Write a structure and sequence with these properties.
Subunit structure (chains A, B): Homodimer.
Structural class of chain A: alpha+beta
Strand content of chain A: 35-45%
GO molecular function (chains A, B): heme binding; heme oxygenase (decyclizing) activity; iron ion binding
Oligomer: homodimer
Number of strands of chain A: 4
CATH architecture of chain A: 2-Layer Sandwich
Largest interface: A-B, 33 and 33 residues
CATH class of chain A: Alpha Beta
Keywords (chains A, B): Cytoplasm, Heme, Iron, Metal-binding, Monooxygenase, Oxidoreductase
Bound molecules: protoporphyrin IX containing CO, chloride ion
Catalytic activity (chains A, B): heme b + 5 AH2 + 4 O2 + 2 H(+) = delta-staphylobilin + Fe(2+) + formaldehyde + 5 A + 4 H2O; heme b + 5 AH2 + 4 O2 + 2 H(+) = beta-staphylobilin + Fe(2+) + formaldehyde + 5 A + 4 H2O
CATH topology of chain A: Alpha-Beta Plaits
Protein name (chains A, B): Heme oxygenase (staphylobilin-producing) 2
Chain lengths: ~110, ~110
């Protein structure tokens, strides 16, 4: 059975990557979900006009991720999150997000 | 100083993801580079008319990744690799590749 990866890709106002990444330091319940394995928060290195921050989560299965998506802890973690496009999103540097999903065909860990 | 991620993104002809992923099962020395931590090989779940396979490598530093790029094992691992557009690559299902680089601002493993 294959592991699974979900990515949330955040398009951010230029210069806002660091303040955004720091919002992820404190866990808000994902660690309680059966099948959750790893989380990475990355800044893309490039010369673009907007920053890019990605949240990669690694799971035992896609079903495990879907259970998290349906969970109270997902909703809790995202309670106060806004997009710049939201009616009350004036202070948000997050222009948009897009979700990508992946089957993991192979993994090696030293 | 942060962990570092490099991605090689393979654009593949439709239906060739599995045969391409299986080429990565056999280690060819990347694991011997100081600073190498993890490798993932993923198939993107989408409805597009090309397959997409991503090779994600996780490192203690960007320096260690560059050291691997410059190594004899990188060259040996890739010596027989061709793109379809190469003179001797007609049967290769690999259409193109693109490299992406990321600073890891946060990591968690359960
Ligand atoms: C693919 C998975 C996924 C999705 C769909 C998603 C949906 C969205 C989304 C648009 C719907 C936006 C704008 C954000 C933005 C954020 N998410 Co997520 N997030 C996701 C993965 C995560 C993860 C993982 C965490 C940490 C959860 C925890 O329990 O620690 C998170 C928490 C956050 C945080 C930090 C917590 C806070 O500020 O209180 C921000 C900012 N976000 N996320
Ligand atoms: C960003 C990192 C990176 C780059 C730039 C890169 C450059 C390229 C590239 C562009 C010319 C192409 C078409 C490929 C395609 C392949 N690479 Co890489 N590869 C990379 C990460 C990897 C990794 C990691 C392995 C396994 C190495 C090992 O030692 O096990 C690999 C090995 C392979 C293999 C399987 C080994 C084999 O069939 O013998 C294919 C196919 N490839 N790679
Ligand atoms: Cl997120
Ligand atoms: Cl590759």
């Amino acid at each position: 059975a294959h592991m699974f990866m979900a990515e949330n890709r955040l398009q951010l106002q230029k210069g806002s990557a660091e303040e955004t990444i720091e919002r992820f330091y404190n866990r808000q319940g994902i660690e309680t979900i059966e099948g959750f394995q790893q989380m990475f928060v990355t800044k893309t290195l490039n010369t673009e006009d907007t920053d890019e921050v990605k949240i990669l989560t690694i799971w035992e299965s896609e079903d495990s991720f879907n259970n998290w998506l349906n969970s109270d802890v997902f909703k809790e973690a995202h309670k106060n999150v806004r997009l710049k496009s939201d009616d009350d999103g004036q202070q948000s540097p997050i222009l948009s997000n897009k979700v990508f999903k992946y089957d993991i065909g192979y993994h090696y860990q030293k």
